[PDB]
RNA sequence: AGGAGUGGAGCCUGCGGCUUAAUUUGACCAACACGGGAAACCUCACCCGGCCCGGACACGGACAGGAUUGACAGAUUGAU
């Protein structure tokens, strides 16, 4: 489905992607995700915290699974998933970065999921 | 009018006093083998050491190379 726009794309991934609890925020996850086959997508994002970590995540993504799609600015992707799951209008207490989150065969594929994403994937 | 006892002896058990780190505590005919209280631990209120949080909920803060949990071996320790 989609208007085929990836990012609005991306969302409708990470609709069902909450519920699924694909999200493996953080590097230790995020090196879990990866070094396992369950993982389907990853994002990523500018420096949070070192140039060193947005490296190494295309170096992981070289020796085990080429999915990588980058969208900067890790206020996006802080917002994107909140403490469990996106949380209010507001919240001001956290909207931290999550700086490169990766996700679990496009959450569910029940529905558009499959269809957005693969109109992107085989070309990136 | 009488019968059998208690008070004497030894022991059991409760109470006072005295001691003691602590000898937990209520009760003075209508308290005193009473708290169905014959306590090894447990009980446990007491004393002496060590550990644990099982401080809900609310508001603010922290914060995804991260809030936070637990632990091998050595030292330490009654203690693995």
């Known amino acids: 489905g989609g208007v085929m726009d990836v990012n609005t794309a991306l ?24 070094d396992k086959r369950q993982a389907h997508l990853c994002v990523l994002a500018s420096n949070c915290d070192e140039p060193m970590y947005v490296k190494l995540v ?15 600015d890790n206020k996006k992707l802080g917002e ?25 065969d496009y959450g569910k594929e029940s529905q558009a999921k499959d269809v957005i994403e693969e109109y992107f994937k085989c070309k990136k």
């Open 11 to 34: 969302q409708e991934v990470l609709k069902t992607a909450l519920i699924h609890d694909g999200l493996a925020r953080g590097i230790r996850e995020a090196a879990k995700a990866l």
């Open 58 to 72: 295309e170096a992981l993504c070289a020796e085990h699974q080429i999915n990588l799609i980058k969208v900067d």
């Open 80 to 104: 994107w998933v909140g403490l469990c799951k996106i949380d209010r209008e507001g919240k001001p207490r956290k909207v931290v970065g999550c700086s490169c989150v990766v996700v679990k």
